[PDB]
Structure 1
Amino acid sequence: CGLDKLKEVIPENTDLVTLGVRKRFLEHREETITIDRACRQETFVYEMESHAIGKKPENSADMIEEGELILSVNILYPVIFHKHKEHKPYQTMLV
């Protein structure tokens, strides 16, 4: 179980299944998507997840003890949104 014996290189020249979908997506990207952008919500999620990576408290007494319950709670307050798009109305919190 090492990395020196593990496959950067173009993922091709092997009998695969998902690689066909991957190449189709690459072609669809080269068609209209330009460089690496238009991923607004994607970068939002990325940064909002990185904001909580390895941040230490200002005081030593504010260290979260091991095993503390973290609960994810979505909230739907507003009516002003897409009732059509599967429903994505409002923010989600952690407590």
Structure 2
Amino acid sequence: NFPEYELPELNTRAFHVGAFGELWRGRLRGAGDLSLREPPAADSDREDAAVARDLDCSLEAAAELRAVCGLDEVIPENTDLVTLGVRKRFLEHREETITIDRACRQETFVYEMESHAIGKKPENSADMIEEGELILSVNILYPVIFHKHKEHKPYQTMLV
């Protein structure tokens, strides 16, 4: 069944997870969007033929699209935008209020827990997961260990 907001922005209606995964794998069935492969002049011609086949255009038009839509750090930042200006001001104020300016232990902790296993390939390739496996991001609320854990409920999230 379709997941839809039961509450405006807090909660969905009860829906079967298997049905939802099947809807998704049905709408992406054999479209090449669920690959789980790593990202890889002769290929240019095949790509242009594919674009001509999928967009009903000419090989010349496909090559033109491939050329024009091409992709289009350095800490210096000038000629700012709104949020870029806010970031510049924040950076300058931090440069004068802080003396060591390195990632706090909680920042590195949250990051190194989040990005602990990303792109980690299976050693066996027999425990490789199938294309389309519906990872659920549960988060289990810690019990009330400290008294203040009633106010702001700490949780640990698991990618089931």
The alignment's TM-score, normalised by the length of structure 2, stands at 0.45
Whether the 8 Å CA contact 1:81–1:89 is kept in 2: the answer is no
C-alpha distance 85-17 of structure 1, shift in aligned 2 (>3 A): farther
Select between 48-57 and 8-17 the one with higher mean Cα deviation: 8-17
Q: Which residue of 2 aligns with 1:63?
A: 128
In structure 1, list runs of 5 or more residues that go unmatched.
Answer: none
1:67, CA displacement in angstroms? 0.3
- RMSD of the TM alignment (CA)? 3.0
Q: How big is the shift at 1:15?
A: 5.4
Partner Cα separation in structure 1 for residue 111 and residue 95 of structure 2: 23
Question: Residue 9 and residue 60 in structure 1: after superposition, are their counterparts in 2 closer, same or farther (change >3 A)?
Answer: closer
Pick which of 60-69 and 14-23 moved more.
14-23
Q: CA-to-partner distance for each residue in 1:5-47, whole Å, 9 max, x for gaps?
A: xxx5565542521122112211221122234424222212322
5+ residue gaps in structure 2? 1-68
CA distance 1:55–1:19, change in 2 (3 Å):
closer
Q: CA deviation at 1:62?
A: 0.5
**Which entry has the higher C-alpha Rg, 1 or 2?**
2
Q: 2:135 touches 2:159 (CA, 8 Å); kept in 1?
A: yes
Relative to structure 1, the CA distance from residue 16 to residue 62 in structure 2 (aligned partners, 3 Å threshold; closer, same or farther) is: same
Rate the CA distance shift 1:27–1:85 in 2: closer, same or farther, 3 A.
farther
Identity %: 100
Number of positions where the alignment pairs a residue of Structure 1 with one of Structure 2: 92
Using a 3 Å threshold, how does the CA distance of structure 1 residues 59 and 13 change in structure 2: closer, same or farther? closer
TM-score by length of 1: 0.69
